[PDB]
């Protein structure tokens, strides 16, 4: 009936860092996925209330969306690119585990992930 | 002793509480789940229920044997289900949390 609090976007205990890879994950990778036509259901955290999905947060316990990833990158939340990529994987994985293969939301997530993999292939060398 | 009790009260209890743990907490009931070809393919079944019963009943000789049963459970899921399947992704989340706990043995 209610949505849980969103994932954190900053943490004083977590060491902050800004690298050219993390800059590329914000300026190139995330910007490309964000501007995509299939991006609108992945921009904010999954609103189980408006979608009439009482079971979504009974199944998914580690939610993730691109808005959370966007704030974390802007707040230098990640120490390296792997941690940021791991949130992307969590966002896609959650969608594949909760929904059926062939659903609209899964076809949409599969298209975003393919473009995501296209940019990750050319992630710059850490300088 | 210290390594076998750590796998029972820390490793097994952490994975048991995980969100994606319910398919792996008990042996696969292929008759109930309507999987007639499961035990034709999986010749070494393993689950968290039996691993729990082996730790609290002194069945392992060292921590390495307990890691084998965990890998056997993960393998039997990666063998029977297609890569990228929902159930496979759930098993990869458990294994990642498993390799993070074993790394701090």
């Amino acid at each position: 009936s209610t949505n849980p609090p969103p994932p954190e976007t900053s943490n004083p205990n977590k060491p902050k860092r800004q690298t050219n890879q993390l800059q590329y994950l914000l300026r190139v990778v995330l910007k490309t996925l964000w501007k995509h036509q299939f991006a609108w259901p992945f921009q904010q955290p999954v609103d189980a209330v408006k979608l009439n999905l009482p079971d979504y947060y009974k199944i998914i316990k580690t939610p993730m969306d691109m808005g959370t990833i966007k704030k974390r990158l802007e707040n230098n939340y990640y120490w390296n690119a792997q941690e940021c990529i791991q949130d992307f994987n969590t966002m896609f994985t959650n969608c594949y585990i909760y929904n059926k293969p062939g659903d609209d939301i899964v076809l949409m997530a599969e298209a975003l992930e393919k473009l995501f993999l296209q940019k990750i292939n050319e992630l710059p060398t850490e300088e | 002793t210290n390594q076998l009790q750590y796998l029972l009260r820390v490793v097994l209890k952490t994975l048991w509480k995980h969100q994606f743990a319910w398919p792996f907490q008990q042996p696969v009931d292929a008759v109930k789940l309507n999987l007639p070809d499961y035990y034709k393919i999986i010749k070494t079944p393993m689950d968290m229920g039996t691993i729990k019963k082996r730790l609290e009943n002194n069945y392992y000789w060292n921590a390495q044997e307990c890691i084998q049963d965990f890998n056997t459970m993960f393998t039997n899921c990666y063998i029977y289900n297609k890569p990228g399947d929902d159930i496979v992704l759930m098993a990869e989340a458990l294994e990642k949390l498993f390799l993070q706990k074993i790394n701090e043995l």
Partner: peptide
């Protein structure tokens, strides 16, 4: 609707 290991829930599609 989706079923995994006995547990069933509503997907976004329904």
């Amino acid at each position: 609707w989706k079923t995994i290991a006995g547990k069933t829930w509503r997907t976004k599609q329904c």
